Amino acid sequence: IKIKEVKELLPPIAHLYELPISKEASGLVHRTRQEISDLVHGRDKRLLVIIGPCSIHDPKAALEYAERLLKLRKQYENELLIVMRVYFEKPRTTVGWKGLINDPHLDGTFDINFGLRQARSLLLSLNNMGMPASTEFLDMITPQYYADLISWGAIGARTTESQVHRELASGLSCPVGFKNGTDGNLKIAIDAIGAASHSHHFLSVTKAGHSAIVHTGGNPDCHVILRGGKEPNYDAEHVSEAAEQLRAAGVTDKLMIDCSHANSRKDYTRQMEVAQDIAAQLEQDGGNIMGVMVESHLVEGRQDKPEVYGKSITDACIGWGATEELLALLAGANKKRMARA
C-alpha cells in the first residue's frame, strides 16, 4: 500500500551505449578536475567560478547560456576557471519539483528514463563544445548515469551532514565542495571533508543496474563552501575564522564562497554586493579563497511556471548583463591577487 508502483528503469549502460563519452569530453573532464584539484590545494591562484542556473529546466536555454559563457571562460582563462552550473536535482524545503531528471516534462509525469537521457545528452553536448560542468549530487543512484561528465560536484547544505552523502563523495572522481548547514554550521562541512577523504564500504548500484558492495578509496579534493546561515558568512572575518577552523582539523584551508542563497538573503540583486566584497578581499589579500558560486541565467528573477524563456523556476537568478559585470569584476580583482605572488 505504501508503495503504489514499481516502474522500469533503464540501467546506466543503456545510456552509455547511446551516448559514449567522446575523447574530447573525456580530456576536458580529466583536465578540469586536475586544474580544480590544484586550486583546492593552493598550487594555482586562479579563481574557480561555478556559475549558471539554479536549475536546468530547458536544455535549449542551457546551451544558449553555455554558448555565451564559453566566450567569457576563454576571455578570463588566466584569472578565472569558469565551470557551468548544470544542476539536475533540487532539494525542496518540503515538496516541489525535484528537477529535470525526476520530472523533465515539468507536469508530474515523472519520466525519469527520459530525464536521465536528456541530462546525459546535455552534459555530453556541453563538454563537447568546451564547457565543463558541475552539479549537485543529491540522489544515490543517478550519479552512475552522468558522473563521468562532471568536473566538480556539490553536496547541498541539507545533506552535508548525511553519512550516505559523505560516502558517495568518497567515491567520486571529481573534486567536491561541501556547503555549510542551512543555519550557518561550518563544522559539519569540515567533518564531511574528513569523512569523504577516507575509504568507505557501503551499498550502491552498478552501471548494469544491480546492487553491490562498493569499497571507495577516499576523495582527497574536497573543500568547504560558505553559503550563509541565519546571517551571511562571506566577509573577510568569516573567511579568516573558517580558515583557522580548517587548519585545526588538518584539512585544506582554501574555500569557496557562494554569492547566492543565504549569502544574498535570497535576493538575487544582492549577489553583486557579495562579489564586490570578495573582489575587495582578493585585492587586499584573500589567500584563503579558491572559488565563488553564482546563480545566473539569461534573464533575471524567477517564476512559478516556465512561461518566460531563460528564467529560473527555482531560486531567482541574476540576468546575463549582470553576469558579464560580475565576471569582469572578479577577473580584474584576481588578476591583481595573482600578480602579488
d(CA 26, CA 149): 7
**Choosing among Mn ion, a copy of itself, none, which partner's interface includes residue 26 (Cβ < 5 to 8 Å by kind)?**
none
**Among residues 32, 134, 151, 159, which is the contact residue for a copy of itself, using CB under 8 A?**
159
Residue 217 binds to a copy of itself (criterion: CB under 8 A): yes
Please, are residues 326 and 318 in contact by the beta-carbon 8 Å criterion? Answer: yes
Please, are residues 256 and 292 in contact by the beta-carbon 8 Å criterion? Answer: yes
Residue 172 binds to a copy of itself (criterion: CB under 8 A): yes
Query: Site mask, Mn ion, residues 40-69, x = CB under 5 A?
Result: --------------x---------------
Between 90 and 238, CB nearer to a copy of itself? 90
Question: Residues touching a copy of itself: how many (CB under 8 A)?
Answer: 70
**Among residues 37, 41, 110, 280, which is the contact residue for a copy of itself, using CB under 8 A?**
110
Query: Scanning residues 179 to 198, which ones bind a copy of itself (CB under 8 A)?
Result: 181-183, 185, 188, 191, 194-195, 198
Say whether 92 counts as a known binding-site residue: no
Question: DSSP label at 46?
Answer: P
Torsion, Cα 143 147 148 149, to 10 degrees, reads 130
Q: 185-191 long-range CB contacts below 8 Å, 24 or more apart?
A: 185/229, 186/224, 186/226, 186/233, 186/242, 186/245, 187/245, 188/160, 188/161, 189/160, 189/224, 189/225, 190/224, 190/245, 190/246, 190/249, 190/251, 191/161, 191/249
Nearest distance in Å: CB 217, a copy of itself: 5
Residue 264 binds to a copy of itself (criterion: CB under 8 A): no
**Residue given cell 585545526 in the structure block:** 248
Say whether 85 counts as a known binding-site residue: yes
Among 267, 272, 261, which residue's Cα sits nearest to residue 326? 272
**Choosing among Mn ion, a copy of itself, none, which partner's interface includes residue 281 (Cβ < 5 to 8 Å by kind)?**
none
Please, are residues 181 and 153 in contact by the beta-carbon 8 Å criterion? Answer: no
Residue 127 binds to a copy of itself (criterion: CB under 8 A): no
Query: Site mask, Mn ion, residues 308-327, x = CB under 5 A?
Result: -------x------------
Give the three-state DSSP class for 223.
Answer: strand
**Residue given cell 533503464 in the structure block:** 10
Say whether 237 counts as a known binding-site residue: no
Nearest distance in Å: CB 316, Mn ion: 9
Q: What is the DSSP string of 290-309?
A: EEEEEEB-SS-BB-SSS-ST
Give the three-state DSSP class for 143.
Answer: helix
Binding-site positions for Mn(2+): 54, 261, 295, 315
Binding-site positions for phosphoenolpyruvate: 85, 90, 157-158, 179, 227
Tell me which residues touch Mn ion (CB under 5 A). 54, 315
Tell me which residues touch a copy of itself (CB under 8 A). 1-11, 13-14, 17-18, 91-95, 98, 102-103, 110, 112-113, 138-142, 158-159, 161-165, 170-173, 181-183, 185, 188, 191, 194-195, 198-199, 201-206, 208-219
